[PDB]
Amino acid sequence: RRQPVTVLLKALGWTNEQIVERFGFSEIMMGTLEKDTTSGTDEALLDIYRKLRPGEPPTKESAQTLLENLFFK
Amino acid sequence: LYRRVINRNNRLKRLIDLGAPEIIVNNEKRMLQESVDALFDNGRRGRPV
Amino acid sequence: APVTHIWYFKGVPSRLGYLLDLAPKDLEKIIYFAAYVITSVDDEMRHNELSTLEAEMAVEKKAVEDQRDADLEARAQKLEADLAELEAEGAKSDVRRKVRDSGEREMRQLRDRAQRELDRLDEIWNTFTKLAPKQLIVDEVLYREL
Amino acid sequence: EALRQARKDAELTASADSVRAYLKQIGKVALLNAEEEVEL
DNA sequence: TCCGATCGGTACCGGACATGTAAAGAGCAGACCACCGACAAGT
Numbered sequence: 001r002r003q004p005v006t007v008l009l010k011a012l013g014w015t016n017e018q019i020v021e022r023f024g025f026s027e028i029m030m031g032t033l034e035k036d037t038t039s040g041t042d043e044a045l046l047d048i049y050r051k052l053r054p055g056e057p058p059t060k061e062s063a064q065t066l067l068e069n070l071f072f073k
Numbered sequence: 074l075y076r077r078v079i080n081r082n083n084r085l086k087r088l089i090d091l092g093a094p095e096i097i098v099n100n101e102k103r104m105l106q107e108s109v110d111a112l113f114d115n116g117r118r119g120r121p122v
Numbered sequence: 123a124p125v126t127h128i129w130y131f132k133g134v135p136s137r138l139g140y141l142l143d144l145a146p147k148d149l150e151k152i153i154y155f156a157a158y159v160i161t162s163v164d165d166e167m168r169h170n171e172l173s174t175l176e177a178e179m180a181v182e183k184k185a186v187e188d189q190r191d192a193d194l195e196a197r198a199q200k201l202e203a204d205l206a207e208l209e210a211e212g213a214k215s216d217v218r219r220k221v222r223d224s225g226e227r228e229m230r231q232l233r234d235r236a237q238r239e240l241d242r243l244d245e246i247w248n249t250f251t252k253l254a255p256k257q258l259i260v261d262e263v264l265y266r267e268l
Numbered sequence: 269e270a271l272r273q274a275r276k277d278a279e280l281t282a283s284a285d286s287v288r289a290y291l292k293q294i295g296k297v298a299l300l301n302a303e304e305e306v307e308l
Numbered sequence: 309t310c311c312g313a314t315c316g317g318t319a320c321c322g323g324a325c326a327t328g329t330a331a332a333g334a335g336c337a338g339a340c341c342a343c344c345g346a347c348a349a350g351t
Contacts, residue, residue, distance in 0.1 A: 001312095046274050055283040055292055057275055085123065100290055102123050103155045104252040107286060117132045119284070134315065147282070156282065182303070260280055 003051060006033045010044040011067070074112040074122075081105045126153050148258055156261040163253050172251075179247055183240065190236040194229065201225050 006029075009019055016033070023029040038044055042060070049056070049063035056062075085101045111122050130137045131153065136146045144152075151157040205219060244268060249259070260266045283289045300308070 043270060046271070050278060051273060055277050055278055055288055056279040057295075097291055098154045100286075100293070103286060103289075105123065106125050106154065109125040110132075112129045114132075117128055119286075151282065154284075154286075260294075 001051060004032050004036050004038075004049065005041075006036045007038060007044040007047060010038075010041055011048050011063075013041070015041075074115075078105070078108045078112055081108050086091070127132055135267075142256070151258065151260070155236065157258045158262075158265045160253060160255050160257050160259070162255055168253070169249075175250075179243065183243060186236070186239055186243075190232065197229055197232070213232065 006019060010016075014022075016039075019029070019033060021032065026055065045063045046058045049058045052066070081101065082103050085105055086100070088101055103116055107119070110118055115121050126138070131149060136149065138144070139146050139149055144148075148157075152159050194240070208218060246264065249264065250268060279292070282291055
């Protein structure tokens, strides 16, 4: 299912300040960031893990390893 | 399909006879249900065999 | 073991769902071994013995509260022993603050554990009182406790 | 916190795939290390 | 009132073709057949 890209950006290790300073020239990005209703890195990572693989109990490292396997390995 | 249904039914009979715990018996019954459903109409529920 | 017919369940609309007034997701969970369904409930027996069951539940809650109080007083006496030890020989204020906040965290953990136990008991009692046929108990441990 | 709610939601997910459901069911119980086997 | 899922359908005649892996081994017993010994009664 669709997820806001701000969640993915935060899950990759970026913060709110990084997103603001990197995508400050766009209005859609700011609107999505204000309407995400989600803060922090661990919460976004857990949400991504739940969306991708429902029914699997998440933890601190399983989601990161899954993301690395999916993309950066 | 008929062989799969018969095999799962016989395995369910053996599991009931032995006295297996509830988890194994429930799993076997679910497998039997899926086998019958695939026999009657393959593709309606889940992935095709 | 009986097996349902795929034609009359996985259809648009679901004939079994219309006949039994059950949502298609509920039927899928029930017939694929994912949630329990209450076939029938003895309303008269539940109503006759409702007061006794409520009294027993209150007794259980009182017992768990007494256990929580015993744990709290054990923590209090351990803290008193620690204070007596700190009075016996001198110590820095930082370690005293550290042990104070550790004790506060431990007592807060005990308090929230007791609160979770009380909430679980309340949920179980509410589920038992609102028990009715054609209701799905999706939690296995809840059904085991019932 | 939110972690407990996420765990509860994950355990209460439908998990339509049969193999995934069986893995979830077998994952509920713990293991026996050295001596509980002898007692059992 | 709006909208993310799910299911239904999408021309005809001619023709064409056939699967690709195995982590083993041993001890004991049961059923059936090709080779045989005796022993008295009917031929």
